[PDB]
A paper describes a structure:
The crystal structure of recombinant Ng-[name] (rNg-[name]) protein was solved at 1.65 Å. A second expression construct that lacked the N-terminal signal peptide sequence and instead contained a C-terminal 6×His tag had a predicted length of 111 amino acids with a Mr of 12,372.05. The latter construct was used to purify rNg-[name] by Ni-NTA affinity chromatography and size exclusion chromatography (SEC) in soluble form for crystallization and structure determination and also immunogenicity studies. The overall fold of rNg-[name] was an eight-stranded β-barrel, and the structure was comprised of two sets of four stranded antiparallel β-sheets (β1 to β4 and β5 to β8), with the disulfide bridge between Cys37 and Cys120 stabilizing the interaction between β8 and β1. Ng-[name] was superposed with Nm-[name] and with members of the MliC/PliC family lysozyme inhibitors found in other Gram-negative bacteria, e.g., Salmonella Typhimurium (St-PliC) and Brucella abortus (PliC). The superposition of Ng-[name] and the Brucella abortus PliC-lysozyme complex showed a conformation of “loop 4” incompatible with lysozyme binding; furthermore, helix α1 of Ng-[name] would also clash with lysozyme. We investigated this further and provide a conservation analysis that is based on sequence alignment of [name] proteins from different Neisseria species. Interestingly, there is little conservation in the region around β6, suggesting that this region is not involved in formation of a conserved interface (compare the green region in Fig. 3). While our analysis revealed some conservation in loop 4, this loop was much shorter in the MliC/PliC family of proteins, explaining why the loop clashed with lysozyme in the superposition. However, the analysis also reveals conservation in the loop 4 region, which is involved in lysozyme recognition, and hence interaction might occur through this region using a different binding mode; this would explain the difference in sequence length in this region between Ng-[name] and PliC proteins.
Author numbering: 5 to 107
Write the structure that this text describes.
């Protein structure tokens, strides 16, 4: 198993939507998957190495839910805004930033 740690981020999205996403991480601090409960079911989206590059990271298969964001690693992951697209190509969580909890 290359996943050795997992970390969770809470987001606030447009249209008052909220989503919590758990990311798996390997020993190098890269990510291995994104997971979120979507319509009361957990959806597991492995990192898509066909689509991901130096600028953009994508999780999920073609035909499924896809999380898209910027560069993701153990340094960056809690600062990156995300979006989640449904299998039918509708954006179901839009313009999601990680929540400020600072006093
Ligand atoms: Na993030």
């Amino acid at each position: 198993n290359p996943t050795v740690a997992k970390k969770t981020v809470s987001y606030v999205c447009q249209q008052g939507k909220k989503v919590k996403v758990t990311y798996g991480f390997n020993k190098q601090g890269l990510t291995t998957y994104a997971s979120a409960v979507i319509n009361g079911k957990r959806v597991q989206m492995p990192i898509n190495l066909d689509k991901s590059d130096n600028m953009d990271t994508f999780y999920g298969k073609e035909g499924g839910y896809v999380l898209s964001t910027g560069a993701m690693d153990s340094k960056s992951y809690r600062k990156q805004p995300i979006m989640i697209t449904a299998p039918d190509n509708q954006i179901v969580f839009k313009d999601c930033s990680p929540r400020l909890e600072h006093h």
